[PDB]
Amino acid sequence: TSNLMEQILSSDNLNRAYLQVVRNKGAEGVDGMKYTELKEHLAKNGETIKGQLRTRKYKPQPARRVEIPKPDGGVRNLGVPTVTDRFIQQAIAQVLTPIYEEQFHDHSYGFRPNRCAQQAILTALNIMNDGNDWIVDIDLEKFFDTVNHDKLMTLIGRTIKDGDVISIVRKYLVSGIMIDDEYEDSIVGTPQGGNLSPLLANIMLNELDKEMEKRGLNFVRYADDCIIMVGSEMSANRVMRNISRFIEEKLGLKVNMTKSKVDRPSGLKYLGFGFYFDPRAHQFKAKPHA
């Protein structure tokens, strides 16, 4: 992974990145450029953009902060990169994703190819129905509002040795990329925050998956939303204290001690799903909660 930049900037990879970003649709960035204007924009400035990326002279535009009304009356915050930056981010992620997919845990389902929130629900249900119905529900503060940039780029540097890639990735951190949490409202759609930041979140949170796997804990995780499932409150209280302490001391993330809870499946809301026990089928099941 010494010279990944030319792979990212290859004719095939950029052509695939353009087509994918056009298919993604999504709202506009601060420049107001819609997805239909990207082809003409790249036909005129594409080579200039490639040259700036090669020399670390490309200036990413700041993400546009938008407020999207939620179906429960509330509002959610979203940062929308320009369609040019979403194009570049997709080009970077097309190269970084195959590298990091072999590292990732099978119970991580957020923003990964061929994975979705419904799989996380069914996997959690199978674990609950095995007798692990004491839920350690650790609530984390927003990942990109709390993650340390230098700590995140250092961890990425353990796998990615191309300095030019490290540079452009860091510049996108400061641009304000974040995690589109539309999935929490049970809405199925294409995320609008670009295709780089969720991978960056999975890289850091993969450290939590590895720690939980070493401790033999059963879990599922979707982006920064994880639940751990154990067989008793005794083990649930111990896991709650050990994992939260690991998240803050080793990962540098922030645990919301007010929203975090030890619970049973009946009172659990996860990824927009509610859980209930079916006495006819003799099993816990899930469905979208109101």
Kindly list the residues in this chain that would bind K ion in the complex (CB under 5 A): 137, 225
Residue 35 as a binder of its own copies (CB under 8 A): the answer is yes
Vertex 240 angle, CA 235 and 241, to 5°: 105
> Dihedral through CA 112, CA 114, CA 117, CA 119, nearest 10?
-130
d(CA 163, CA 168): 9
d(CA 171, CA 65): 17
Radius of gyration over alpha carbons of the chain, in Å? 20
Residue 126 as a binder of its own copies (CB under 8 A): the answer is yes
- Of positions 52, 97, 129, 235, contacts its own copies by CB under 8 A: 129
Residue 27 as a binder of its own copies (CB under 8 A): the answer is yes
DSSP letter assigned to residue 2: -
Residue 285 as a binder of its own copies (CB under 8 A): the answer is yes
- Of positions 2, 11, 114, 258, contacts its own copies by CB under 8 A: 114
Q: How far is the CB of 60 from its own copies (least distance, A)?
A: 21
Residue 185 as a binder of its own copies (CB under 8 A): the answer is yes
Q: How far is the CB of 188 from K ion (least distance, A)?
A: 17
Q: How far is the CB of 268 from K ion (least distance, A)?
A: 9
Residue 187 as a binder of its own copies (CB under 8 A): the answer is yes
Q: Which is nearer to its own copies, 118 or 148 (CB)?
A: 118
Q: Which is nearer to its own copies, 246 or 277 (CB)?
A: 277
Other Cβ atoms within 10 Å of 246 Cβ, number: 17
d(CA 240, CA 233): 10
Q: Which is nearer to its own copies, 20 or 167 (CB)?
A: 20
Residue 77 as a binder of its own copies (CB under 8 A): the answer is no
Vertex 104 angle, CA 255 and 256, to 5°: 5
Please classify residue 241 by burial: count the beta carbons closer than 10 Å to its beta carbon, then call 0-12 exposed, 13-18 middle and 19+ buried. Answer: exposed
Residue type, 15: N
Grouping H, G, I as helix, E, B as strand and the rest as coil, residue 105 is: coil
Cβ contact 271:183 at 8 Å: yes
Q: Which is nearer to its own copies, 61 or 119 (CB)?
A: 119
- Of positions 82, 84, 94, 192, contacts its own copies by CB under 8 A: 192
Q: How far is the CB of 138 from K ion (least distance, A)?
A: 5
d(CA 22, CA 36): 7
Give which of K ion, its own copies, none residue 197 binds (C-beta under 5 to 8 Å, depending on kind): none
Q: Which is nearer to its own copies, 19 or 234 (CB)?
A: 19
Three-state secondary structure along 219-257?
EEEECCEEEEEECCHHHHHHHHHHHHHHHHHCCCCCECC
Residue type, 14: L
Residue 23 as a binder of its own copies (CB under 8 A): the answer is yes
Vertex 104 angle, CA 101 and 110, to 5°: 90
Residue 38 as a binder of its own copies (CB under 8 A): the answer is no
Q: How far is the CB of 132 from K ion (least distance, A)?
A: 15
Binding segment for its own copies (CB under 8 A), chosen from 4-12, 185-193, 196-204, 241-249, is 185-193
Contact residues for its own copies (CB under 8 A)?
Answer: 23-27, 34-35, 68, 71, 114, 116-119, 121-122, 125-126, 129-130, 185-190, 192, 273, 278, 280-288
